[PDB]
Symmetry: D2
Subunit: 119 residues, 4 copies
């Protein structure tokens, strides 16, 4: 899976990456994995090399990453303490985070247009 959808009451999923869960895609000889680790660090790996992280290892147990409806990605511990947030917020709406073939992780939104074909 390549995408997390912002919290919303519909069956778009995933909306949460719990500990041990990840986005992953393949490019060439590279696996890119964006994973909420059991030590509370959310990391992007290119094969076994860490390329970017929230640097929150050791802050909590049972952490999850959630994308809020204003586009902010947060990591929250199992006691419900937010230990990291992305730094820019948008208008409330619907957003997606995508792990992309170019190795960038990008949050896009809000939604500009849709077919309106839910169901």
């Amino acid at each position: 899976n390549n995408i997390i959808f912002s919290k919303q009451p519909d069956d778009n999923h995933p909306q949460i990456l719990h500990a041990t869960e990840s986005l992953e895609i393949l490019f060439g000889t590279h696996v890119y994995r964006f994973i909420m680790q059991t030590d509370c660090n959310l990391v992007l790996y290119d094969n076994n090399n860490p390329i970017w992280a929230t640097n929150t290892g050791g802050l909590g147990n049972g952490c999850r990453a959630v994308l809020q409806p204003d586009g902010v990605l947060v990591v929250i511990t199992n006691e419900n303490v937010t230990v990291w947030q992305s730094p820019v917020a948008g208008k409330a709406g619907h957003y997606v985070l995508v792990l992309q073939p170019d190795r960038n992780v990008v949050i896009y939104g809000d939604a500009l247009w849709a077919t309106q074909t839910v169901r």
Copy 2:
């Protein structure tokens, strides 16, 4: 694949749906396909039932769908005549179109934040 990326100079793909190509995902035993047909109609199917279309069948040959850098999705023929465009545009930037598990097809953008981990 579930996503089209807006035309841009990087290796995100796909950026064009040529004729016969599609996005496709599964929801249970339903297959959702968003396909650029040979007859120039761009159609969302739930299994074999058409649920939405640009209604452009017969209007051109050798058609493609592209997501422009202002977030407008267009269907263009092999003589470069645009025969359909979505109706709302945003600022120039990067956008994505996603076929979602809830059966909506949505354009999001522009990019709000990224890890900046290209390449």
Copy 3:
């Protein structure tokens, strides 16, 4: 996933289909699922239509399917009673069960040749 590997001491997986798990592939807009149901019946579905089954529903609880090292597929309950087995056995070795695009589910083995590239 399209394949079950016979029980063996290496990291090939899956080697067991626990209840609710399945093999699944797509052929066009048909979904073929070979599922170990909660009611102990192991069933091949074409979409929502059952096309073959072990006819073991209600015979046990908490059932699993495993492919033994002689190529026999068995359904075993959570009290380790075998309630169904395929009818032909081969020599001990390594075998695979595959859900194939032609909608047949086939057990092959034992291994005839390999690159010998484990690990």
Copy 4:
């Protein structure tokens, strides 16, 4: 895709890996790719490291790999010269080659049992 099926008149596919085509699976931080290259060498790579090859680079152009009905995998050039064969043959039947999570590439067959649910 993880499997090649032996040549047979049914729509199990793939039965041929043409030049540039490959099997690929992910394990952990590893991509394993088994690819018929444009230089006629059929290679198994673990990320960018070649781990095993037929050593047929430079023997031909437009080569393809085919799994015959007696279980022998061959590489054949676009002039139809066989330039490599696996060394053990079985009875004629149906076989499969699988690129496995343990990094072994294995041909299994002949078929021992099937549901007989073709269609």
